[PDB]
Amino acid sequence: AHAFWSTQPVPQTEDETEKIVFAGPMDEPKTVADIPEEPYPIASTFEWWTPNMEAADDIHAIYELLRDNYVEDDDSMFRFNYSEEFLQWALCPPNYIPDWHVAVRRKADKKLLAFIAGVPVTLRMGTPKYMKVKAQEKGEGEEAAKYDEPRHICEINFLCVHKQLREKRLAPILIKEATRRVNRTNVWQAVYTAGVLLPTPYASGQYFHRSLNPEKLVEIRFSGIPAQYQKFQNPMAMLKRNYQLPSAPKNSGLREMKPSDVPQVRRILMNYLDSFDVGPVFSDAEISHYLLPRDGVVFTYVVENDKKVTDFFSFYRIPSTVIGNSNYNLLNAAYVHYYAATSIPLHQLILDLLIVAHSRGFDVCNMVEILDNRSFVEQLKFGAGDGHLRYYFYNWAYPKIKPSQVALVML
Numbered sequence: 001a002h003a004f005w006s007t008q009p010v011p012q013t014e015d016e017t018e019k020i021v022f023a024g025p026m027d028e029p030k031t032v033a034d035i036p037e038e039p040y041p042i043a044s045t046f047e048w049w050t051p052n053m054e055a056a057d058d059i060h061a062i063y064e065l066l067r068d069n070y071v072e073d074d075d076s077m078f079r080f081n082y083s084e085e086f087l088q089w090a091l092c093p094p095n096y097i098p099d100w101h102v103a104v105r106r107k108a109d110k111k112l113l114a115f116i117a118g119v120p121v122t123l124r125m126g127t128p129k130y131m132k133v134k135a136q137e138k139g140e141g142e143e144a145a146k147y148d149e150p151r152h153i154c155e156i157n158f159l160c161v162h163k164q165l166r167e168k169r170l171a172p173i174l175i176k177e178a179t180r181r182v183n184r185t186n187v188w189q190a191v192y193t194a195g196v197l198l199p200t201p202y203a204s205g206q207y208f209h210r211s212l213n214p215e216k217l218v219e220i221r222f223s224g225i226p227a228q229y230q231k232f233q234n235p236m237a238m239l240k241r242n243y244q245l246p247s248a249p250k251n252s253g254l255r256e257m258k259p260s261d262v263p264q265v266r267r268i269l270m271n272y273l274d275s276f277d278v279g280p281v282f283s284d285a286e287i288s289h290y291l292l293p294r295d296g297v298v299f300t301y302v303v304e305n306d307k308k309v310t311d312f313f314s315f316y317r318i319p320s321t322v323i324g325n326s327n328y329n330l331l332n333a334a335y336v337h338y339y340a341a342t343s344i345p346l347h348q349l350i351l352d353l354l355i356v357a358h359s360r361g362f363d364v365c366n367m368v369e370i371l372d373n374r375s376f377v378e379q380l381k382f383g384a385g386d387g388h389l390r391y392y393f394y395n396w397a398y399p400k401i402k403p404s405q406v407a408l409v410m411l
């Protein structure tokens with residue numbers, strides 16, 4: 001069934017993954033010296049290219065490839081339009097490796113054909129809580145704890161082949177060359193997400209949406225008007241009313257995050273994430289990079305009363321092109337990022353996220369059912385969407401976990 005994935009170090013079936021009881025590698029140990037020094041071979045008319053994703057013109061070339069060829073729905077209504085500023089932020093965190101950003105171009109004229117990107121992350125990925133209990137019952141705690149230490153791995157994102165080059169087996173070549181470059185840096189696992197089902201996820205969650213501008217969402221056919229609203233004289237008036245929000249935040253002391261908040265925000269975030277089976281470990285530099293506000297890109301607010309930061313939330317912006325509507329160009333979506341609540345209930349924290357995003361001109365707030373996101377779905381009027389985000393590892397055996405045990409947000 002899978003001419004490429006059957007040759008890779010991943011679990012091959014659901015039934016195999018149901019059988020895994022400890023975290024650890026799939027492949028034999030290898031060394032940097034074992035890995036080919038030269039790029040993987042590619043057709044003579046193509047050439048490998050490493051963009052510099054801090055230089056404006058190279059970022060722009062990658063932006064146009066994704067604008068015109070990245071994720072779109074099956075009805076070709078919406079396609080992601082990540083901004084140039086977003087790509088520089090996502091691709092260049094502290095200690096990033098320029099070599100892990102991999103492109104193919106046509107040699108003759110330099111037309112960009114394909115891309116894939118890796119960034120470093122430190123991830124807790126040892127055996128999950130429920131399987132460590134089973135290990136204790138059986139006298140197998142030592143094997144279950146062998147890989148408990150956080151590991152420096154690769155996160156992969158932005159895999160993209162040009163629409164004129166689809167179904168020619170170019171994606172497997174991109175993945176093999178990414179893998180080589182990563183392994184030449186002595187890193188042997190990766191984490192990735194996809195909306196498609198491949199061999200084999202360790203966790204899967206539904207998407208959720210919260211309408212912020214329901215008249216626009218119905219106009220572009222992102223949303224429809226639900227049937228019972230037809231019992232009203234003015235269905236759209238009642239829909240608007242149902243989703244209305246306050247014009248200003250409700251929590252006293254909410255303000256934008258600043259550099260001096262970095263240590264207190266790292267503390268409350270890490271104490272919270274530690275309770276989940278799979279999650280990141282962030283330094284002060286990575287908390288600054290992923291959470292300090294950047295215009296058009298990442299928005300982060302803290303609750304400070306009486307001089308102490310007790311809570312915070314963040315969201316990020318990804319617009320999508322509206323392909324078929326002749327009245328709107330873009331869908332402006334806000335995605336729930338990291339958060340931590342110590343002084344107020346989580347629903348009260350996240351209502352101010354929705355108030356801020358609406359005030360700033362967003363049309364919808366989206367998220368997946370990771371972290372404690374299920375805890376405010378009903379009260380804050382989110383609804384489940386179509387399909388699911390699946391979490392995968394490369395070269396790591398891992399027991400199936402629930403999405404509410406996943407604390408890693410993928411951009």
Ligand SMILES: CCCCCCCCCCCCCC(=O)SCCNC(=O)CCNC(=O)[C@H](O)C(C)(C)COP(=O)(O)OP(=O)(O)OC[C@H]1O[C@@H](n2cnc3c(N)ncnc32)[C@H](O)[C@@H]1OP(=O)(O)O
Binds near residue numbers: 003156158193
């Ligand atoms: C240690 C370091 C490890 C580093 C690497 C870790 C692994 C990283 C893995 C990547 C994680 C990326 C995370 C993200 O970015 S998910 C975002 C993916 N991008 C999009 O959906 C953008 C629009 N679509 C495209 O650009 C293409 O259709 C892509 C590029 C997706 C496939 O191009 P194309 O349609 O022209 O097909 P092909 O003939 O070249 O190749 C077909 C083979 O590709 C397999 N395929 C299809 N979709 C995906 C998918 N989303 N992940 C993994 N594999 C996928 C498929 O099962 C088949 O294999 P097999 O079934 O025959 O065996």
